[PDB]
């Protein structure tokens, strides 16, 4: 199945991590844990803002422009991205904004980190209507020495 994984400020505001006003190493660990040994699909913006490829996974970059690195697979459409994953139980889609919009209709599962922060931005995770998505897991945490804000992990499954 196809899954989306995302870190969301309030009102579904998203961004590249290194520009967001927070430090959430716990989210980092949750991300690696839920993507480990799965193919990931990302947009070029996200690809750039992490420099290297995610280790041990098929890394698939969706871009209209030609590839600029041979350690990853470069595709030019949603269908091409999916096809390049071959036969696996789960594909992880890791952003960013337009990428999330494109894959949401094909996804059966969401992995979301809610972050207790208000941040200005023009990029948002797509609207996931409560009537369409069942919350099957929620795990609340508060701020500590390592994590700057309260954060809540959530998994939802398409009804």
């Amino acid at each position, epitope marked *: 199945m196809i899954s989306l994984i995302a870190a969301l400020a*309030v*009102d*579904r505001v998203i961004g590249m991590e290194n520009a967001m006003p927070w430090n959430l190493p716990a989210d980092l660990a949750w991300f690696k844990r839920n993507t480990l040994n799965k193919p990931v699909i990302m947009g070029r913006h996200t690809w750039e803002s992490i420099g290297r490829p995610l280790p041990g996974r098929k890394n698939i970059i969706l871009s209209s422009q030609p590839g600029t690195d041979d350690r990853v697979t470069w595709v030019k459409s949603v269908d091409e991205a999916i096809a390049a994953c071959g036969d696996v139980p789960e594909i992880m889609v890791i952003g960013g904004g337009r990428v999330y919009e494109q894959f949401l209709p094909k996804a059966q599962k969401l992995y979301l980190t*809610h972050i*207790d*922060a208000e941040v200005e931005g023009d990029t948002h995770f797509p609207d996931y209507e409560p009537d369409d998505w069942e919350s099957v897991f*929620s795990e*609340f945490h*508060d701020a500590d020495a390592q994590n700057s804000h*309260s954060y809540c992990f959530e998994i939802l499954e398409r009804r």
Partner: nanobody
Amino acid sequence: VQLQESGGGLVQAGGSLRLSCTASGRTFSSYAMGWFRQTPGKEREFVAAITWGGSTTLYADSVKGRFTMSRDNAKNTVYLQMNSLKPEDTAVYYCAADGSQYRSTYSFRDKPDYGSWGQGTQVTVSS
């Protein structure tokens, strides 16, 4: 999802009163919360709001610098600390939960959607 205001009663002008609002319902800590006040016959006035995790607040200009809203998710409670009260502050104060998850204080205030309301607590300031 259900709310109960507490605190409040008579206070002299210039004094302080602390209100609390306790919720029953497991999913409390995924909703913004707000305080409102109302005198008989008049529309509700927005007073304060706070995000789900309690880090970020928004205040009506009429109470800014005087009122502080805060939150304790481990106790399913939000509070309203009211200092330097005036006769004009006299009203029924209500607690309200957002109908939608994980919104900003701004959305809570400017795009109203109310999951539920408390029964209210009377706050009365003399002169």
